[model samples]
Target: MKPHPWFFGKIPRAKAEEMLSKQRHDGAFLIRESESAPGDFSLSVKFGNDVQHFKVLRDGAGKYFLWVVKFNSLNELVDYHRSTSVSRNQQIFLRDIE
Candidate 1:
């Protein structure tokens, strides 16, 4: 559990990879992360599993960042998708406004 229900806290990359691998295998679950570049939206192949979800971030360079979407099952991700998407999509659709 985190202080802000909208954001999942950080963990080391090694741990994140380990968790990703597990979900990809044992879960037979696919997981994913959504993000954006300076002018477009995209995705990264963090893990190929039975889940179709992801975690995302925006760096200083306005690049698409694939981090963690909470290391757990699809059930866990469902709750986050709604909230996180709101913050992340703002950056993804920030082009062609002129």
Candidate 2:
């Protein structure tokens, strides 16, 4: 399978913010490895004038999830959010840069 362009490994929060900020569009997003915690991941999403950071949690079964929703892989998670709202109260969705 092809690699996911949205996933940026080992990128710092500032760098992720800068990359997403450059997109200048609501719902622009990328997934990066967490700086503070190794093996963990973060989702930085552009919402309105600011970027929101969310934790991408992995379960013992190797499934990934954001908030309460779960998926078999990071690709699946991103695919779901691309079409659905990322937030319960907000209208944010994942918009790929490419």
Candidate 3:
């Protein structure tokens, strides 16, 4: 199966920052493999002057979640956040990169 366009496999945090910087827009984001936590994922979202990184948690049952929201798959999480704000304090939505 094909992966989502926003999914960047095994990329470092710096690279994700570099790519998001070029976009130069709030809400621009990408998902990459977690370097510190094998098998898990990381979410890099560009908000204002900096990029915020959040770990995509995978439970024992194989469900993915970021904070309180739980999703069946990574795609579902991304899709849900596309229209809804990822952060409660800020208006951060997932804007796809190229």
Candidate 4:
């Protein structure tokens, strides 16, 4: 019953794109919603061959919760994630932890 990495399940690609674009426009550090489905995202560092993929995800309310964030660098993102406290009710983006 495991879902595929590319398959976003209930959340449509258009919806994710719009939310992500809107978040970027708003210049927010993070984005979260109370009733969103879990998101499946991957970060590909150094595209082409030998690329390393980092993943981030969060559980939604029986759907995909769109959570996006802005970071200066991948390292900074990881550091920030490590420094922040985990939330039971809020959406989170876990780096490299599928």
TM-score of each: 0.25, 0.89, 0.90, 0.23
CA deviation > 4 Å runs, candidate 3: 1-3
True-structure lDDT of candidate 1? 0.32
Ranking by TM-score: 3, 2, 1, 4
lDDT of 2 at 61: 92
lDDT at 44 for candidate 1? 20
Q: What is the lDDT of residue 8 in candidate 4?
A: 33
True-structure lDDT of candidate 4: 0.35
For candidate 3, lDDT tens digit of each residue in 11-41?
8889988888778678889999999897789
Q: Which lDDT values do the candidates have, in the order given?
A: 0.32, 0.86, 0.88, 0.35
- Per-candidate Cα RMSD to the true structure, in Å, reads 13.3, 1.4, 1.7, 14.6
Tens-digit lDDT track for model 2 on 4-94?
7787888899998887777878999988999887888899998877888988888889999877888998888889998998888798989
Worst 10-residue lDDT window for candidate 3 reads 18-27
Which candidate, 3 or 4, would have the higher TM-score against the true structure?
3
What TM value does model 1 have?
0.25
Among all candidates shown, the one with the greatest lDDT: 3
What is residue 5's positional error in candidate 2, in angstroms? 1.7
